Amino acid sequence: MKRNYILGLDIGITSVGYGIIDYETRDVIDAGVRLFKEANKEIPTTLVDDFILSPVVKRSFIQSIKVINAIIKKYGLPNDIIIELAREKNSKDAQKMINEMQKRNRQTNERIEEIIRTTGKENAKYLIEKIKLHDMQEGKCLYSLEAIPLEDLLNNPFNYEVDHIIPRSVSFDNSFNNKVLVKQEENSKKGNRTPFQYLSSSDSKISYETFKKHILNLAKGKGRISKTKKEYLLEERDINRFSVQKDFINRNLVDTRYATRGLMNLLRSYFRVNNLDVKVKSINGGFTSFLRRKWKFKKERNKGYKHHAEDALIIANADFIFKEWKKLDKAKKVMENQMFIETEQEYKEIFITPHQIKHIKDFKDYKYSHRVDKKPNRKLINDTLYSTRKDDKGNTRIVNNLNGLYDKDNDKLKKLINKSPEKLLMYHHDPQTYQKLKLIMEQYGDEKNPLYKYYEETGNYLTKYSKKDNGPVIKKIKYYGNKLNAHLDITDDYPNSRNKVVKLSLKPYRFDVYLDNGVYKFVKVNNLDVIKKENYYEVNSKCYEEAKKLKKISNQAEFIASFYRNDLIKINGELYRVIGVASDLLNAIEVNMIDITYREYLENMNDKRPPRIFKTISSKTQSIKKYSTDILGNLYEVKSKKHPQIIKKG
RNA sequence: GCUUGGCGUUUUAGUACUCUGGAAACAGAAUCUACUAAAACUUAUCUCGUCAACUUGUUGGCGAGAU
DNA sequence: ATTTGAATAGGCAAGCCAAGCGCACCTAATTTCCCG
DNA sequence: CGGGAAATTAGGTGCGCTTGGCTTGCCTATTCAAAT
């Protein structure tokens, strides 16, 4: 559209958030998320292949580019793009960082618990950050070097103040590493100067040399200070030099990782070459979280995928602040990589926005675009082998095995004997050993595992029945499991095998829905049913026609649609995304929600249902419709081809 | 692409182990439980145009439109 | 009027990921020995 | 007698092993409503 806008992006391991806002008013236009599985005319994706990355990151940059290309074609060229690459590099690194963060959140809260016991005051817990700075400094304000009593901080919270080591106006750093607990008078005297500049002036109580020695002694050994904090405390360069300010801006505002640099270089190159006035920027992972604390907007990653989108809208509003405030013009220019604030109150006033955050938080019309997998899954089948047997009723059944019979907490056999004694093969074939086992289960019924007590009390494993007491130990028990339906037969690998040798869990490729005289019906196509040829896969025709016959699908039945993983389905007027075929036999298909994983939907509600949706396709089913989202999450109601596909060249 | 081995799943061969013929050797059944030996484990949807694979009526890529 | 089918809850199992515990190896600080 | 360098001790880091949760495929079982 004619209207001019900003594009936020929150790039992640599995996701690319986007957020679109009016360049004049800062009202929300649009927002959504593009979701994908972690890789364990318009902007091309071949440039990502040029410069070397982790696979996990490499996928996201390809996905991001296609989301930018889709926004450009819909809304036209943005005025400003601004990007946030997630802190993590892969999911393991993410989890490690979350664990490290959680460990720190434990380390902070454990210090609170000890002091509120000792002192016995309530305003302590409100004073979150002033407590931890007392730990770092070893009980002394660093500018003066005089002692802080612990209760004196609680008695006089005014007479001490959290100071920024390097003025926030120059560094843009609000991190704990740029913070120090100091006396109120010392803060007032320092002003907008570094410790070096202040302690070199006539206003200071102590010499810089004394201070420097203290910091260096504080750095090594126990009660340690971070490298970044140490560097800030010992910053000697002229704050007022542009080169020095540039360094602070680059450290705090501009993200400094090889990937993030690589990405913005890709994008800026593209716009530069084609002569398109687009201002690509980036912001530091931490910085967004400051704005969330500032604007009272608790990061809830459990509040669906929208968190990625509502991160992008935040990132996009930061861009508005780095355009409307002439005092940030230097910072703006640094962030745009273009060739070339006096008080704390002034700094704080620049970033006050109460209004448009209500728009962001109360915004509703989000969109989601899950990516669809149509590659036959290398995993064909569970590799476990099962023997089979025909039971009393003449049903072929899977043979399972009970292992770990003599374990403390194993109730599998006790459950099975009480419910289904006829499920044991030994029930039919070794009655004398069966009767011998039943006497044990009756003897030590009260425990989880009767056999554990048999081993504990007597000190002897259970042996097969024998006339001379020389039968072998029993270490596994075979029992009849599932009725045998869809299986793979591998018995010709075992010459003269008495019983049939099989594998199970025929991993679905897709399911094809048919409308047959007003009744909705479907066929499952297995990965086994798909066979690699020269440069293509082929669905097996004979297995397919046999499958229709078990489902009683007529020759004059209309095909409706094929549904792969993450394909969208509207069942009785309710839209979902497909996982797969829960049960061919029962005619069930596994779906999920679109805006949130159904697990998380239930957790935010505090509901204790199973976290899976299953939808039965039946005489009761009234309409089935296929939908498809574009890469932005705009929804479309879509038809099918006349017949199902057989060959798959991709 | 080749070789070896420990743990696990399956089977055969032989022996142990249940049942019947037999004084006993020995044979048959049954195949449960074990020991010894061998083998194996990039793409959203439809429709149309166009091009190519070969399966010759289907598919995949690309362009346009719609959804 | 009774029998068959639908929808949801609850469990089993394979594969795969991730986090906490234990053993062996690597780096820095303090104490002891030798020289100005 | 005091300061600097080397050897020994204590603490921190990295690799490998194990268990619980997550994603998916599917069967058995229970309860209610519709069809022959």
mmCIF file of N, CA and C in Angstrom, chain A residues 254-325:
data_model
loop_
_atom_site.group_PDB
_atom_site.id
_atom_site.type_symbol
_atom_site.label_atom_id
_atom_site.label_comp_id
_atom_site.label_asym_id
_atom_site.label_seq_id
_atom_site.Cartn_x
_atom_site.Cartn_y
_atom_site.Cartn_z
ATOM 1 N N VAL A 254 24.681 -1.717 18.409
ATOM 2 C CA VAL A 254 24.890 -2.483 17.187
ATOM 3 C C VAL A 254 25.337 -3.882 17.621
ATOM 4 N N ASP A 255 24.699 -4.945 17.099
ATOM 5 C CA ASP A 255 25.025 -6.310 17.498
ATOM 6 C C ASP A 255 26.338 -6.729 16.829
ATOM 7 N N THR A 256 27.248 -7.339 17.621
ATOM 8 C CA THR A 256 28.596 -7.701 17.195
ATOM 9 C C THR A 256 28.734 -9.220 17.309
ATOM 10 N N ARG A 257 28.147 -9.919 16.322
ATOM 11 C CA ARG A 257 28.380 -11.333 16.065
ATOM 12 C C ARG A 257 28.541 -11.539 14.559
ATOM 13 N N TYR A 258 29.358 -12.540 14.180
ATOM 14 C CA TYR A 258 29.756 -12.761 12.792
ATOM 15 C C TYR A 258 28.523 -12.981 11.907
ATOM 16 N N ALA A 259 27.536 -13.753 12.406
ATOM 17 C CA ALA A 259 26.287 -14.021 11.700
ATOM 18 C C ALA A 259 25.491 -12.730 11.481
ATOM 19 N N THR A 260 25.278 -11.943 12.557
ATOM 20 C CA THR A 260 24.431 -10.755 12.510
ATOM 21 C C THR A 260 25.044 -9.726 11.557
ATOM 22 N N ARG A 261 26.372 -9.520 11.641
ATOM 23 C CA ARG A 261 27.106 -8.691 10.692
ATOM 24 C C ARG A 261 26.907 -9.218 9.270
ATOM 25 N N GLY A 262 27.074 -10.540 9.069
ATOM 26 C CA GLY A 262 26.894 -11.185 7.775
ATOM 27 C C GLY A 262 25.521 -10.907 7.161
ATOM 28 N N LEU A 263 24.462 -11.007 7.986
ATOM 29 C CA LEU A 263 23.091 -10.827 7.528
ATOM 30 C C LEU A 263 22.878 -9.396 7.037
ATOM 31 N N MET A 264 23.196 -8.395 7.875
ATOM 32 C CA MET A 264 22.919 -7.007 7.524
ATOM 33 C C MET A 264 23.760 -6.580 6.319
ATOM 34 N N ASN A 265 24.968 -7.156 6.159
ATOM 35 C CA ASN A 265 25.787 -6.932 4.974
ATOM 36 C C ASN A 265 25.104 -7.492 3.722
ATOM 37 N N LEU A 266 24.510 -8.702 3.804
ATOM 38 C CA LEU A 266 23.683 -9.261 2.731
ATOM 39 C C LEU A 266 22.620 -8.235 2.330
ATOM 40 N N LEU A 267 21.847 -7.745 3.315
ATOM 41 C CA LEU A 267 20.659 -6.945 3.047
ATOM 42 C C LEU A 267 21.061 -5.567 2.518
ATOM 43 N N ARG A 268 22.012 -4.895 3.191
ATOM 44 C CA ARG A 268 22.460 -3.570 2.779
ATOM 45 C C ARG A 268 23.051 -3.612 1.370
ATOM 46 N N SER A 269 23.871 -4.638 1.055
ATOM 47 C CA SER A 269 24.365 -4.863 -0.303
ATOM 48 C C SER A 269 23.210 -4.872 -1.307
ATOM 49 N N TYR A 270 22.144 -5.648 -1.019
ATOM 50 C CA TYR A 270 21.024 -5.826 -1.936
ATOM 51 C C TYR A 270 20.363 -4.480 -2.245
ATOM 52 N N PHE A 271 20.020 -3.708 -1.197
ATOM 53 C CA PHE A 271 19.303 -2.448 -1.356
ATOM 54 C C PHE A 271 20.200 -1.429 -2.070
ATOM 55 N N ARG A 272 21.490 -1.356 -1.678
ATOM 56 C CA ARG A 272 22.480 -0.482 -2.304
ATOM 57 C C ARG A 272 22.542 -0.709 -3.821
ATOM 58 N N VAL A 273 22.671 -1.979 -4.262
ATOM 59 C CA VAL A 273 22.865 -2.327 -5.673
ATOM 60 C C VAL A 273 21.636 -1.882 -6.480
ATOM 61 N N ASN A 274 20.422 -2.195 -5.986
ATOM 62 C CA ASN A 274 19.181 -1.968 -6.721
ATOM 63 C C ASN A 274 18.633 -0.547 -6.517
ATOM 64 N N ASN A 275 19.294 0.288 -5.678
ATOM 65 C CA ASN A 275 18.987 1.705 -5.491
ATOM 66 C C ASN A 275 17.592 1.826 -4.875
ATOM 67 N N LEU A 276 17.463 1.308 -3.640
ATOM 68 C CA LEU A 276 16.212 1.273 -2.897
ATOM 69 C C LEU A 276 16.488 1.875 -1.520
ATOM 70 N N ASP A 277 15.781 2.972 -1.179
ATOM 71 C CA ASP A 277 16.040 3.731 0.040
ATOM 72 C C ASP A 277 15.442 2.966 1.223
ATOM 73 N N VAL A 278 16.219 2.003 1.750
ATOM 74 C CA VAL A 278 15.805 1.146 2.851
ATOM 75 C C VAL A 278 16.942 1.155 3.880
ATOM 76 N N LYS A 279 16.603 1.469 5.143
ATOM 77 C CA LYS A 279 17.576 1.648 6.211
ATOM 78 C C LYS A 279 17.559 0.405 7.099
ATOM 79 N N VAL A 280 18.489 -0.536 6.842
ATOM 80 C CA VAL A 280 18.612 -1.770 7.615
ATOM 81 C C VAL A 280 19.391 -1.406 8.879
ATOM 82 N N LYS A 281 18.941 -1.914 10.040
ATOM 83 C CA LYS A 281 19.561 -1.659 11.334
ATOM 84 C C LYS A 281 19.593 -2.968 12.123
ATOM 85 N N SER A 282 20.180 -2.945 13.329
ATOM 86 C CA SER A 282 20.050 -4.027 14.297
ATOM 87 C C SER A 282 20.098 -3.468 15.710
ATOM 88 N N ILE A 283 19.599 -4.264 16.664
ATOM 89 C CA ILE A 283 19.613 -3.903 18.068
ATOM 90 C C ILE A 283 20.082 -5.125 18.855
ATOM 91 N N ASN A 284 20.693 -4.870 20.020
ATOM 92 C CA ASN A 284 21.312 -5.911 20.821
ATOM 93 C C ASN A 284 20.219 -6.717 21.519
ATOM 94 N N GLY A 285 20.437 -8.036 21.635
ATOM 95 C CA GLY A 285 19.500 -8.963 22.250
ATOM 96 C C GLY A 285 18.993 -8.455 23.598
ATOM 97 N N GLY A 286 19.930 -8.044 24.476
ATOM 98 C CA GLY A 286 19.643 -7.498 25.796
ATOM 99 C C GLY A 286 18.763 -6.245 25.760
ATOM 100 N N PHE A 287 19.054 -5.302 24.840
ATOM 101 C CA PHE A 287 18.397 -3.996 24.779
ATOM 102 C C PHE A 287 16.871 -4.126 24.750
ATOM 103 N N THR A 288 16.316 -5.037 23.921
ATOM 104 C CA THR A 288 14.869 -5.230 23.830
ATOM 105 C C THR A 288 14.307 -5.564 25.214
ATOM 106 N N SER A 289 14.990 -6.433 25.990
ATOM 107 C CA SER A 289 14.520 -6.815 27.318
ATOM 108 C C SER A 289 14.450 -5.603 28.254
ATOM 109 N N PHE A 290 15.378 -4.629 28.127
ATOM 110 C CA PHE A 290 15.315 -3.382 28.891
ATOM 111 C C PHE A 290 13.984 -2.675 28.622
ATOM 112 N N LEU A 291 13.628 -2.504 27.334
ATOM 113 C CA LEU A 291 12.396 -1.838 26.929
ATOM 114 C C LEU A 291 11.178 -2.574 27.496
ATOM 115 N N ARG A 292 11.231 -3.912 27.590
ATOM 116 C CA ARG A 292 10.141 -4.703 28.149
ATOM 117 C C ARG A 292 9.990 -4.441 29.652
ATOM 118 N N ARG A 293 11.113 -4.321 30.387
ATOM 119 C CA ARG A 293 11.101 -3.934 31.799
ATOM 120 C C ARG A 293 10.589 -2.495 31.947
ATOM 121 N N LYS A 294 11.103 -1.578 31.103
ATOM 122 C CA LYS A 294 10.753 -0.161 31.109
ATOM 123 C C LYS A 294 9.248 0.016 30.899
ATOM 124 N N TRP A 295 8.696 -0.638 29.855
ATOM 125 C CA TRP A 295 7.313 -0.459 29.432
ATOM 126 C C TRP A 295 6.380 -1.509 30.050
ATOM 127 N N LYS A 296 6.868 -2.290 31.045
ATOM 128 C CA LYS A 296 6.051 -3.131 31.916
ATOM 129 C C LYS A 296 5.280 -4.124 31.047
ATOM 130 N N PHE A 297 6.039 -5.022 30.399
ATOM 131 C CA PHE A 297 5.546 -5.885 29.337
ATOM 132 C C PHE A 297 6.283 -7.217 29.461
ATOM 133 N N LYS A 298 5.819 -8.076 30.388
ATOM 134 C CA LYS A 298 6.579 -9.240 30.830
ATOM 135 C C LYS A 298 6.752 -10.187 29.640
ATOM 136 N N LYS A 299 8.015 -10.553 29.327
ATOM 137 C CA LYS A 299 8.305 -11.528 28.283
ATOM 138 C C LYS A 299 7.734 -12.872 28.742
ATOM 139 N N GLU A 300 6.721 -13.337 27.995
ATOM 140 C CA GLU A 300 6.086 -14.628 28.199
ATOM 141 C C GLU A 300 6.228 -15.362 26.868
ATOM 142 N N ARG A 301 7.316 -16.147 26.760
ATOM 143 C CA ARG A 301 7.580 -16.971 25.586
ATOM 144 C C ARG A 301 6.509 -18.068 25.494
ATOM 145 N N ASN A 302 5.947 -18.469 26.653
ATOM 146 C CA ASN A 302 4.819 -19.388 26.727
ATOM 147 C C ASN A 302 3.508 -18.771 26.208
ATOM 148 N N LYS A 303 3.422 -17.444 25.958
ATOM 149 C CA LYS A 303 2.221 -16.832 25.384
ATOM 150 C C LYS A 303 2.252 -16.973 23.861
ATOM 151 N N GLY A 304 2.413 -18.217 23.389
ATOM 152 C CA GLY A 304 2.362 -18.544 21.982
ATOM 153 C C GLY A 304 3.557 -18.018 21.208
ATOM 154 N N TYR A 305 3.430 -18.156 19.887
ATOM 155 C CA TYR A 305 4.428 -17.694 18.945
ATOM 156 C C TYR A 305 4.366 -16.177 18.852
ATOM 157 N N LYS A 306 3.225 -15.548 19.219
ATOM 158 C CA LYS A 306 3.049 -14.102 19.133
ATOM 159 C C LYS A 306 4.188 -13.371 19.845
ATOM 160 N N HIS A 307 4.811 -13.949 20.902
ATOM 161 C CA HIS A 307 5.943 -13.313 21.574
ATOM 162 C C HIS A 307 7.019 -12.885 20.569
ATOM 163 N N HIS A 308 7.329 -13.734 19.572
ATOM 164 C CA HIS A 308 8.265 -13.396 18.507
ATOM 165 C C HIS A 308 7.774 -12.196 17.704
ATOM 166 N N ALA A 309 6.463 -12.145 17.391
ATOM 167 C CA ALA A 309 5.857 -11.037 16.660
ATOM 168 C C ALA A 309 5.816 -9.768 17.514
ATOM 169 N N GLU A 310 5.410 -9.872 18.792
ATOM 170 C CA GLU A 310 5.290 -8.698 19.648
ATOM 171 C C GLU A 310 6.678 -8.229 20.098
ATOM 172 N N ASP A 311 7.719 -9.084 19.998
ATOM 173 C CA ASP A 311 9.100 -8.616 20.019
ATOM 174 C C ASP A 311 9.397 -7.764 18.792
ATOM 175 N N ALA A 312 8.997 -8.204 17.590
ATOM 176 C CA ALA A 312 9.255 -7.438 16.377
ATOM 177 C C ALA A 312 8.595 -6.050 16.446
ATOM 178 N N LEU A 313 7.364 -5.927 16.986
ATOM 179 C CA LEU A 313 6.675 -4.638 17.081
ATOM 180 C C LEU A 313 7.452 -3.695 18.008
ATOM 181 N N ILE A 314 7.976 -4.212 19.141
ATOM 182 C CA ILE A 314 8.840 -3.459 20.055
ATOM 183 C C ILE A 314 10.060 -2.933 19.297
ATOM 184 N N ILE A 315 10.768 -3.828 18.596
ATOM 185 C CA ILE A 315 11.982 -3.499 17.863
ATOM 186 C C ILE A 315 11.656 -2.363 16.887
ATOM 187 N N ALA A 316 10.473 -2.428 16.245
ATOM 188 C CA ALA A 316 10.019 -1.437 15.274
ATOM 189 C C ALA A 316 9.729 -0.081 15.925
ATOM 190 N N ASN A 317 9.207 -0.059 17.165
ATOM 191 C CA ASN A 317 8.988 1.189 17.888
ATOM 192 C C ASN A 317 10.303 1.836 18.333
ATOM 193 N N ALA A 318 11.327 1.041 18.697
ATOM 194 C CA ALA A 318 12.650 1.573 19.011
ATOM 195 C C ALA A 318 13.192 2.400 17.842
ATOM 196 N N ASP A 319 12.935 1.952 16.603
ATOM 197 C CA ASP A 319 13.295 2.678 15.392
ATOM 198 C C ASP A 319 12.643 4.066 15.333
ATOM 199 N N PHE A 320 11.362 4.176 15.741
ATOM 200 C CA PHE A 320 10.648 5.449 15.820
ATOM 201 C C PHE A 320 11.351 6.395 16.797
ATOM 202 N N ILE A 321 11.838 5.856 17.928
ATOM 203 C CA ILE A 321 12.546 6.642 18.933
ATOM 204 C C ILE A 321 13.901 7.074 18.351
ATOM 205 N N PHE A 322 14.578 6.199 17.588
ATOM 206 C CA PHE A 322 15.808 6.566 16.888
ATOM 207 C C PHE A 322 15.509 7.190 15.514
ATOM 208 N N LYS A 323 14.402 7.948 15.364
ATOM 209 C CA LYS A 323 14.226 8.884 14.254
ATOM 210 C C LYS A 323 13.649 10.236 14.704
ATOM 211 N N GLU A 324 12.709 10.248 15.671
ATOM 212 C CA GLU A 324 11.998 11.459 16.063
ATOM 213 C C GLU A 324 12.808 12.338 17.020
ATOM 214 N N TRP A 325 13.848 11.784 17.670
ATOM 215 C CA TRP A 325 14.620 12.503 18.672
ATOM 216 C C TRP A 325 15.973 12.894 18.071
#
